[PDB]
Amino acid sequence: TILGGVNKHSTSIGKIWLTVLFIFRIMILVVAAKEVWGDEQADFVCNTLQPGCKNVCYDHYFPISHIRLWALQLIFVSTPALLVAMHVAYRRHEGSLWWTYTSSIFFRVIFEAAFMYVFYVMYDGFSMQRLVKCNAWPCPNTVDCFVSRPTEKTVFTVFMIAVSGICILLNVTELCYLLIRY
Amino acid sequence: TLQTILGGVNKHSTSIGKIWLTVLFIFRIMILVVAAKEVWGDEQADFVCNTLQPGCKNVCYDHYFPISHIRLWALQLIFVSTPALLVAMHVAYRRHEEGSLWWTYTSSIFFRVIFEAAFMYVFYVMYDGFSMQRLVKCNAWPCPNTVDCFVSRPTEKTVFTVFMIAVSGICILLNVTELCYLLIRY
């Protein structure tokens, strides 16, 4: 019903393509992705005998796991759609509505652009490495630690980034139509 | 029936109260449920202490985490929502057959700000700020002189701690404006 409640009050591009891609991301996140990151810390392996070196090295290289960045991102970009829907809902039950609608799609592009930026700086590209070298205290000189399932995590990382990039373009095209029509 | 219950809660509210307060409430619940609840999944499983003394890990973990963060947020969310459905059924009881409606409403928004302030106060005093440390030094019995123990995911837990505090602080501001916005109309 939440899906069927937001069916109306949109343009042909905004009718479906944004919505189907949004459903696409959630299905990938829930059905498939969350079991890949299930044992991110359980199978983190470091070659040392120092107690506590594993905890600090894992926390240093993964300040926040990918699945929870995407979970945050989905929540943020969902609110402007939801908020405008209920905003127009009670009055129904032109200039102002146009003012709100363009603002609604203006926030989406901001959030997705902001979040794609974070992955790039934080994780230094979209590819995961098999080996990480760690020298934070209490670890001795330098320690080799090994990541769990690096290849599978890369595949979903690329998949999510590419789909997010598509959603940016669709929002932009929706904006330009509303720009020319004024 | 999350949509249905709040739909009744939506009735007889001011602009900011109609939209902004309830969307923030769903915002906090979503973060707590789908994201944060499994950051703290292995609080005690990956607590690590550098000692050979049996039971030092149990006493040191309990000394530094008297109550978990997620279980404080759960308690806070329960408390701040009770006045919501308290009035909902109370009027439904009366309806089944202004000032009283006024008296109930201003009291309701007065308890919400009280509970949020009190709970937000507990985090500060009991955890000494909003930032967790990688290392905790423990000397409670039966541990020998002083033992180093290491926390699990200190950086991630800090991120959600800040995010929860910031959102809770906003809910206080909206409630305060609601009181001022309401009082002037009289």
Author numbering:
A (entry chain B): 8 to 100, 129 to 217
B (entry chain A): 5 to 101, 129 to 217
Give the article text.
Connexins form large-pore channels that function either as dodecameric gap junctions or hexameric hemichannels to allow the regulated movement of small molecules and ions across cell membranes. The hemichannel is composed of 6 connexin subunits arranged around a central funnel. Each subunit consists of 4 transmembrane helices (TM1–4), an N-terminal helix, which lines the funnel entrance, a cytoplasmic loop, two extracellular loops, and a short C-terminal tail. Here, we use cryoelectron microscopy (cryo-EM) to determine the structure of human Cx26 gap junctions under increasing levels of PCO2.
To examine this more quantitatively, we carried out a further classification without imposing symmetry and with the same numbers of particles from each PCO2 dataset. As the N terminus is located at the interface of two subunits, we created a mask incorporating two subunits and again carried out a process of particle expansion, subtraction, and masked, fixed-angle classification as above, but using four classes (see STAR Methods). These were symmetry-expanded in D6, and the same mask was used for particle subtraction and 3D classification, with appropriate changes in pixel and box size for the 55 mmHg data. Red boxes indicate the full, extended N-terminal helix (NT) position, and blue boxes indicate the truncated, raised NT location. The remaining two classes in each data set represent intermediates between these two extreme classes.
